[PDB]
Structures are given as C-alpha cells and as structure tokens.
Design a protein around this ligand. Structure first.
Ligand SMILES: Nc1ncnc2c1ncn2[C@@H]1O[C@H](COP(=O)(O)OP(=O)(O)OP(=O)(O)O)[C@@H](O)[C@H]1O
Ligand SMILES: [Mg+2]
Lengths: 256, 52
C-alpha cells in the first residue's frame, strides 16, 4: 500500500532532525582545473585522503599536500567548475556506507543510490582506505564455495576466503561464469557483491535483470561505475566494493 | 531336414516379428516418460516465472 501520510511524517521527522546552529569550518579556493584534477589554495587543516566538498553535491579527494596548494581529483563531471569557487573541508577521510540493509540495491562508488528505489539505509560508515588484517589474525580456508559449474568445482575448487582470478580474452564467458557463481550462492548462505568497473551501461542493466530473474538479487550488492564516468570514480570503485565486503567478514559471516 | 528347416525358419521369422514389436512398445513407453517429464518441468518453470 502506497500511503501519503507516512511520507509526510517522514518529511516532518527530517525537519526535526535538522540542527540550525552552525559550525566553524576551514575553507579554501579552487585555483586550477584540468581533466578532473584540481589545484586548491587554502585548507591549512586538510589531511591526505580527506573528502573535500565542492559546490553542488560533488566531492574531491586530496592527493598531494604541497607547500602552498592541494592537489585533488573530482569525483564526477568536473567541467562545471571554475577557479575561485569556495571549497569546504569535511574532516572525514574517504568513506562509504556499510550494512546488511544494502542487499538488493544498486549503488554509486560514493555510496549514493543509482536505482530509483530511494534513499539508503546503512549501519554507519566504513573507511575506503584501510590496511587488511595481519598475519596472526588470519585463519586457514576450510569450507567450499559451490558455484554452478562442473569444471571449476571439480578441477579448480575455491574455498571461502580464497582469491581466484578469472582470466581470458574478450567474449570468452568471464562475466557469465562470475554471475553464475553469484546465482548459485542464492541458497548457500553466502552474501554476494558484484563490482562493475568500466562496463558498458546496457550490460550492467541486463546483468542486474538476470540476477533478479533467478532471484539472486535479494542476496547481492551491486556497485556501478560506467564507462562514461570520470576515471577517479572507476579507480575508487573496487576499493568501495572491498569496504562493503569487509563488513560481513568482521561479523563472522561469509561473503563473495 | 527339409521338414526341420521349414519349421525352424518359421520359428525364427516369428521371433523377429515379436522382438521388433517389443522394441517399438518399449520405445513408446520411453516416449511417454519423456513427455510426462516434459509436462512436469513445464509446470515447475511456470511456478518460478510468476514469482519473478
Ligand atoms: N555455458 C555456456 N554455454 C554457451 N554459451 C555460453 C556459456 N557461458 C557463456 N556463454 C556465452 O558467452 C558469450 C559471452 O559471455 P560473457 O559476457 O560472460 O563473456 P566475457 O568474456 O566475460 O565478455 P566481455 O569481455 O565482453 O565482458 C555469450 O554469448 C554467452 O551466451
Ligand atoms: Mg564482462
């Protein structure tokens, strides 16, 4: 049942959540723009890897802290910017939402939803840049990951926690094998994540539609960076995808 | 051995006609198995499609 009253109540709740009192912030100015790279003057309090908020809803990543400038990259279409625009510093190091409420959603590498479903529910944030658990914290892999195919379960078996590279030429069945692996975990209690970097968009929609067609979609997170989008978004796509998978790992669950 | 040969050739000819029929009978049974399993899989597939 679609219900107007519950939407109105939610909007009122957002008004209540808003805090009117302001907070002091360190500010800076865009100095130069080219190819998604940015040079910023100011931001004396910035840290490397920080998220800088630009005009609009777009963000940038601080890469170099030079003596008198900051080198940064825009996470979106950079053409709309111009020298002199004010940029504010969110102390947040690059972050993205995490939680089990993400299952069944299509999401941008910045955590924003790309599907028409609506706003996103998450169990806080996890950092995109982190160092993996050390040698003592690891455990031997001792459980199977049953994908659909006969060959790879018989000749090249994969254990939970293993890393296995599917390699071949173009139009050789790489994508089909991977998503059939996802689809066979539909009932095995293993959560699945699919990260699409640089694929043609129509492909991604068809893949999600086939995942839905077999009922696996409710067990998957899908992260999308199309071939049209800025190179920085593509470069950071797999790191965001990794940040989501670690949520299940650290709570004692299994993910693919 | 003329009497014997005529009788025995007829017994052989009988045998072949009979066994041809039992092969064809078993083939129609296997047909029926294949088609009934076709009906079964048709229904199962439809049960998936409606949920989608
Ligand atoms: N088991 C299979 N039997 C027959 N055809 C198959 C099988 N698995 C995949 N294919 C076919 O392989 C073709 C390409 O599949 P897929 O998109 O997975 O390839 P790819 O190598 O990953 O491609 P790309 O590099 O463009 O992403 C399709 O035509 C698909 O039908
Ligand atoms: Mg592919």
């Amino acid at each position: 049942q679609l219900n107007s009253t519950e939407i109105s109540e939610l909007i009122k709740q957002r008004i209540a959540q808003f805090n009117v009192v302001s907070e002091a912030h360190n500010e800076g100015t865009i100095v130069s723009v080219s190819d998604g790279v940015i040079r910023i003057h100011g931001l004396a309090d910035a840290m490397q890897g920080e998220m800088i908020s630009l005009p609009g809803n777009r963000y940038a990543i601080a890469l170099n802290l030079e003596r008198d400038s900051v080198g940064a990259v825009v996470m979106g279409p950079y053409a709309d910017l111009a020298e002199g625009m004010k940029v504010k510093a969110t102390g947040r190091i690059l972050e993205v939402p995490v939680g089990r409420g993400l299952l069944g959603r299509v999401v941008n590498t910045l955590g924003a939803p790309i599907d028409g479903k609506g706003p996103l529910d998450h169990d806080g944030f996890s950092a995109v840049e982190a160092i993996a658990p050390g040698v003592i914290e690891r455990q031997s892999v001792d459980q199977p990951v049953q994908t659909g195919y006969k060959a790879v379960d018989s000749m090249i078996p994969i254990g939970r926690g293993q890393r296995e590279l599917i390699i071949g030429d173009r139009q050789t069945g790489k994508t089909a094998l991977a998503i059939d692996a996802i689809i066979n975990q539909r009932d095995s209690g293993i959560k699945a994540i699919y990260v699409a970097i640089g694929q043609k968009a129509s492909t991604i929609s068809n893949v999600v539609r086939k995942l839905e067609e077999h009922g696996a979609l409710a067990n998957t997170i899908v992260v999308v960076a199309t071939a049209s989008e800025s190179a920085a978004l593509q470069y950071l796509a797999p790191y965001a995808g990794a940040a989501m998978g670690e949520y299940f790992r650290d709570r004692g669950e299994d993910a693919l | 051995d003329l009497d014997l040969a005529k009788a025995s050739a007829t017994d052989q000819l009988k045998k072949a006609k009979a066994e041809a029929q039992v092969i064809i009978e078993q083939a129609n049974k296997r047909r029926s198995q294949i088609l009934d399993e076709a009906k079964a899989e048709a229904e199962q597939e439809r049960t998936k499609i409606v949920a989608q």
